[PDB]
Write a protein that binds this ligand. Structure first.
Ligand SMILES: C[n+]1ccc(C[C@@H](SCCNC(=O)CCNC(=O)[C@H](O)C(C)(C)COP(=O)(O)OP(=O)(O)OC[C@H]2O[C@@H](n3cnc4c(N)ncnc43)[C@H](O)[C@@H]2OP(=O)(O)O)c2cccc3ccccc23)cc1
Ligand code: NA
Ligand code: NA
Length: 575
């Protein structure tokens, strides 16, 4: 009973687009972009033709952007999924004195998964109602049904999102089939614990060890598509891939790390496993959910997020963790490795280690204040924090950049997200006043600039979540144009448009109720990834960047965030 994603008016989107980019390009580049957009948007022109094709599309589809967005955000992306794509959720520290304590946790977690899947298959789950901005409104539930049912196949140029029930268990880079529902008749926690004891014993036998095929899923998508094409030439490889493809989830029983179990190092283990020499091959990145249960108590889940976004994921995992309860041998999946496959594995190992060494990651806990203080200033906490991130970026790098912030459009049928473009002209005015000390702008006027930047950020936020923002609209017009002619219209070849979609700062808010946190890598080589968790009295930031970029630094950016939050508290405390 949810409404269809709206199609905003064309002239609205084009005027918002120009206002979004004017302050981020030169005078001359903008003048050219203005002329291009005017011709695109002229009466009887190409824009209007495309808009009419888009309204026809809205009438005939449940959601007119779903296919375009899924390809542009995920399936067309050629980069390896670790760090570049798959986010990580880190649970609370656990203490596993013995192996059976780790395996009791795993058994308890798996049966929590089985019972959660039974609720979904009940189709009796009450509709989620929004929290925060525009509270109380009903939200789409489709994403819950992609948590367990999905596998992402690699393609040469574009990926594809695709019996008795079983889990796959990864241990010592070996994969084991663990059947769990054996005719609508679930195995108990006790049975699962017993089955996991057998897997650990068998995975420990070095005479029986098979090559670490999971490492192949860590490569570039076109490279893994090619390697997979080799594998499927043999029958027993095909059967093994089939079991992984139809599994409920992965459960990875990781070896202990060597390092201090800081929040930052626990996150690193969930994001890439520390590479081939630690837990990096104890993975299968094509599958949507990989639950990690490390021997040292490091536990979380790695997500192939093409079928769902973070809010739905965390509601599931918080459900699982809260409800957790305090016979043939599982089959080991077999493989036949060509001489060629041996070479694919060597390159996968080398490419994966470059990712491991390239990632610069920090978990930073701002503890001077949280949402409560911000609400007392009559501000949205998310908008407050977004403005602070723009100040952080500007005081460090002395420029503002196209920024991405996730906004859920789950108020509409099959809605996923649109983009809140936080790098507004009001943000620019504020951060310049704060950092340009020659200008000597009085603190009272800085406060007025702070309040107007928050106002603009909230206004864009409301627009985005009601389906009236620009990114999805423009994407659809672009891909509708592409279908009529491979030569795209000038508006989408314009350097201004290409720049507008290089998100040097890529952000999202994922609040949790518990001690878990979320993190992901940047989406451009010279950029940051920034996932935050605002609580009443604290704000948790997970900051990523790439060591190969000499300008970026996760530690420096985190100190800039702290400085920006203190500056903004001092400004709000004036009046
Ligand atoms: C490029 N790429 C794409 C994707 C990814 C992976 C991501 S996938 C995206 C996951 N993220 C989302 O999907 C975010 C969805 N969120 C929304 O869309 C929100 O709507 C948003 C953020 C727009 C606004 O945030 P808000 O909280 O709604 O608004 P607020 O902050 O203003 O309200 C708070 C409190 O303040 C009150 N209030 C408001 N105004 C006030 C005022 N003026 N005065 C006083 N009070 C005021 C409110 O009433 C409330 O009150 P309270 O409830 O506390 O009592 C991901 C991350 C992590 C893990 C993943 C795992 C799996 C899959 C994906 C994962 C990475 C990179
Ligand atoms: Na978008
Ligand atoms: Na860097």
């Amino acid at each position: 009973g949810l409404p269809k994603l709206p199609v905003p008016p064309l002239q609205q989107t084009l005027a918002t687009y120009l206002q979004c980019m004017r302050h981020l390009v030169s005078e001359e580049q903008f003048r050219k972009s203005q002329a291009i957009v005017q011709q695109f948007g002229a009466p009887g022109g190409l824009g209007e033709t495309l808009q009419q094709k888009l309204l026809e599309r809205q009438e005939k589809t449940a959601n007119w952007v779903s296919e375009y967005w899924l390809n542009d955000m995920y399936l067309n992306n050629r980069l390896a999924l670790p760090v570049n794509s798959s986010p990580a959720v880190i649970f609370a520290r656990q203490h596993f004195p013995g192996t059976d304590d780790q395996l009791r946790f795993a058994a308890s977690l798996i049966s929590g998964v089985l019972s959660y899947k039974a609720l979904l298959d009940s189709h009796s789950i009450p509709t989620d109602c929004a929290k925060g901005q525009l509270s109380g409104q009903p939200l789409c539930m489709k994403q819950y049904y992609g948590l367990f049912s999905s596998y992402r196949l690699p393609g040469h140029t574009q990926d594809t999102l695709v019996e008795p029930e079983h889990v796959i268990v990864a241990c010592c880079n070996q994969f084991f089939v663990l059947d769990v529902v054996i005719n609508f008749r679930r195995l108990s926690e006790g049975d699962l614990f017993t089955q996991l004891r057998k897997i650990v014993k068998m995975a420990s036998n070095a005479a029986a060890r098979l090559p670490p095929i999971g490492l192949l899923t860590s490569d570039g998508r076109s490279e893994w598509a090619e390697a997979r094409t080799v594998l499927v030439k043999d029958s027993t490889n095909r059967d093994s891939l089939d079991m992984i493809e139809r599994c409920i989830c992965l459960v990875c029983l990781d070896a202990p790390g060597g390092v201090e179990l800081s929040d930052t190092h626990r996150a690193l283990q969930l994001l890439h496993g520390g590479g081939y020499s630690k837990n990096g091959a104890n993975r299968w990145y094509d599958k949507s959910l990989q639950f990690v249960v490390g021997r040292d108590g490091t536990c979380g889940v790695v997500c192939e997020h093409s079928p769902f976004d973070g809010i739905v994921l965390v509601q599931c995992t918080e459900h699982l963790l809260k409800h957790m309860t305090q016979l043939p041998a599982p089959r080991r999946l077999r493989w036949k490795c060509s001489p060629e496959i041996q070479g694919h594995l060597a390159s996968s190992a080398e490419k994966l280690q470059r990712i491991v060494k390239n990632l610069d990651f920090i978990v930073y806990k701002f503890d001077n204040y949280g949402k409560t203080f911000i609400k007392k200033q009559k501000c949205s906490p998310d908008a407050f924090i977004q403005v602070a991130l723009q100040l952080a970026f500007y005081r460090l790098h002395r420029r503002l950049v196209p920024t991405y912030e996730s906004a859920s459009i789950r108020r509409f049928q099959e809605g996923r997200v649109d983009n809140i473009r936080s790098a507004t002209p009001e943000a620019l005015a504020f951060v310049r006043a704060v950092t340009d000390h020659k200008a000597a702008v009085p603190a009272s006027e800085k406060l007025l600039l702070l309040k107007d930047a928050i106002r603009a950020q909230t206004a864009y936020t409301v627009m985005a979540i009601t389906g009236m923002a620009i990114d999805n609209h423009l994407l659809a017009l672009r891909e509708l144009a592409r279908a009529m002619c491979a030569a795209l219209p000038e508006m989408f070849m314009d350097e201004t448009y290409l720049m507008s979609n290089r998100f040097v700062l890529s952000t999202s808010q994922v609040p949790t109720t518990t001690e878990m946190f979320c993190c992901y890598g940047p989406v451009v080589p010279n950029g940051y990834g920034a996932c935050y968790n605002p609580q009443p009295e604290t704000i948790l930031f997970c900051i990523s960047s790439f060591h190969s970029c000499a300008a970026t630094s996760s530690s420096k950016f985190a100190k800039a965030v702290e400085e920006s939050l203190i500056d903004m508290r001092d400004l709000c405390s004036l009046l």
